[PDB]
Amino acid sequence: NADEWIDTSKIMLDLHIDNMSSSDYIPSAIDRTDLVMVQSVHLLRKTGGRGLFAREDIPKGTCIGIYTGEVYSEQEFEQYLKEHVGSDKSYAMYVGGRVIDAARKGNLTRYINFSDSQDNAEFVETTLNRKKVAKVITTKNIKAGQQLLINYNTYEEQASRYYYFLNPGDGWLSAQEFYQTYQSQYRLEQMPYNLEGFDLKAGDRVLMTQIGRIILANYSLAKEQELNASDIDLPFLKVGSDEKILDFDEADTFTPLMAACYLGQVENVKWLIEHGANIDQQQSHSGHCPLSLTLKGYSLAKDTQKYIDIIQLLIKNQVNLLVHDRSDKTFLHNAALVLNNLDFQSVVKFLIGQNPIDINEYFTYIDENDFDIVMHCYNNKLFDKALVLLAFYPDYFKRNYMSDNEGHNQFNINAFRKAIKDFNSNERSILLMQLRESGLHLPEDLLEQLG
Ligand SMILES: Nc1ncnc2c1ncn2[C@@H]1O[C@H](CSCC[C@H](N)C(=O)O)[C@@H](O)[C@H]1O
Ligand SMILES: [K+]
């Protein structure tokens, strides 16, 4: 037997996997156990969650391994779920008409946690002994010690409503251990003003870096010499009433860039971005990021222009506009709600000017009500912003209602009808006027189906 030459006990000892029997670890020949390691994810400690981390720098496009597991046909797997109380699909990979369930048996790939806006790796179909399987390939350069994150390419309402928003920087250390490790970069300070956008009142104790203190004082980073860009994304660490640090799962931290965005410090935002701040960083519980926090600051401000400028900076630096809150609203969703008509138009114009490859990507994300951004505008009666979106992307109806996928087309017709179900005669005639506008070239039959 050839498996007698495979020592999975040593594989797991080398990877730091401590919650699998050796007879349940299923290696593949392309597994790069030299490049990765399994560790606890401190954020997930209350469920003993683990993750897969880079043991060294990994170049973009490197193969990590094969998603191994127990093999079922689709029918067999449904029968399994039906017969095994408490089993679920958390580890089930649907590929090639088969199901590869890594819930009980598998390899290192079973430890990669989820993100759809900060994934640095992806599942891709490959061939193995003439059958289709899933392999993991990095989609960005990974720095040693960062967690690998991957999009599961499925919808799970429980996921959007209960998962944490994981970052590549979320590791095995607690907030206490992180502070101890980098103590010389932190100083304890008292908040001198309220800051509801991060749930801080005047007088709260917070551990801050020099960069963070500069942001909170409203000083300019560019005027400072001897700034240590290493801790640019090291977080503000809140300190509890018992004078102990709040752990990562007890309170969201934030970065200097998050704060600069919320506060509208345009030049500081530019400086932070140019010095490598993760413009896609997300707070663990809330999901708030530079984009959402800029929108928040805009909602609470007399000077809205600096926030529009910050959104412009972010978009110029390839910020991920497909990030979404817990209701699966993307940035365009929520910006439709927060920005006035002129500013919403200006931001869509910025995005236009970045010349996105697939504009339709922005129009295929649906929120918890199954509304894409156009349906969303209409359901909130933002006729002007709906027209702005239609002018941005005239092909919207063509590509999402008259595609070659009749299932998708009908789902979208039904979702559009749902979005407008509460219109009165006046709103319906305004909508029909917009839709009959020459530029969309909507066929009469689709118009019938829409109203
Ligand atoms: N972003 C996230 N926040 C919280 N839990 C997550 C998560 N991403 C993945 N998970 C957990 O991990 C499961 C996928 S298997 C991923 C490995 C798992 N964390 C483990 O230690 O075995 C999900 O069903 C969910 O329970
Ligand atoms: K403010």
Residue numbers in the entry: 82 to 532
Direct quotes from the study:
One example is the secreted effector RomA, encoded by the gene lpp1683 in L. pneumophila strain Paris but present in all L. pneumophila genomes sequenced to date. This T4SS-secreted effector contains an N-terminal SET domain, responsible for the methylation of host histones and several ankyrin repeats, located in the C-terminal moiety of the protein, for which the function is not known yet. The homolog of RomA in L. pneumophila strain Philadelphia, named LegAS4 (22) and encoded by the gene lpg1718, shares 96% homology with RomA. LegAS4 is composed of two domains, the N-terminal catalytic methyltransferase domain with a SET fold as described for typical human SET domain-encoding proteins and a C-terminal domain with six ankyrin repeats, including the N- and C-capping structures.
Here, we report the crystal structure of the RomA homolog of strain Philadelphia in complex with S-adenosyl homocysteine (SAH) and a 15-mer peptide corresponding to the N-terminal tail of histone H3. The structure with the 15-mer peptide was resolved at a 2.22 Å resolution and the one with the 12-mer peptide at a 3.0 Å resolution. Although it contains three lysine residues in the sequence that could potentially enter the active site cleft, with the SAH cofactor at the bottom, it is clearly Lys14 that enters the active site in the context of this peptide. The peptide assumes a U-shape conformation with the arms following grooves on either side of a bulge created by a short, two-turn α-helix at the beginning of the post-SET segment (235–253aa). The N-terminal arm of the peptide, Thr3-Ala7, binds to the ankyrin repeat domain, and the C-terminal arm, Gly13-Arg17, interacts with the SET domain, inserting Lys14 into the active site for methylation. The Lys4 sidechain enters the groove between post-SET and ankyrin domains, H-bonds with Asp451 and the carbonyl of Asp448 (ankyrin domain), and stacks against Tyr236 (post-SET). Gly12 and Gly13 continue the bend allowing Lys14 to enter the cleft leading toward partially buried SAM. Importantly, interactions of the five N-terminal residues with the ankyrin domain account for ~50% of the P1-LegAS4 contacts, suggesting that the ankyrin domain of LegAS4 is essential for the binding of the N-terminus of histone H3 and for subsequent lysine methylation. Importantly, the catalytic tyrosine is found in front of Lys14 of H3, together with the SAM, confirming the preferred target of the enzyme.
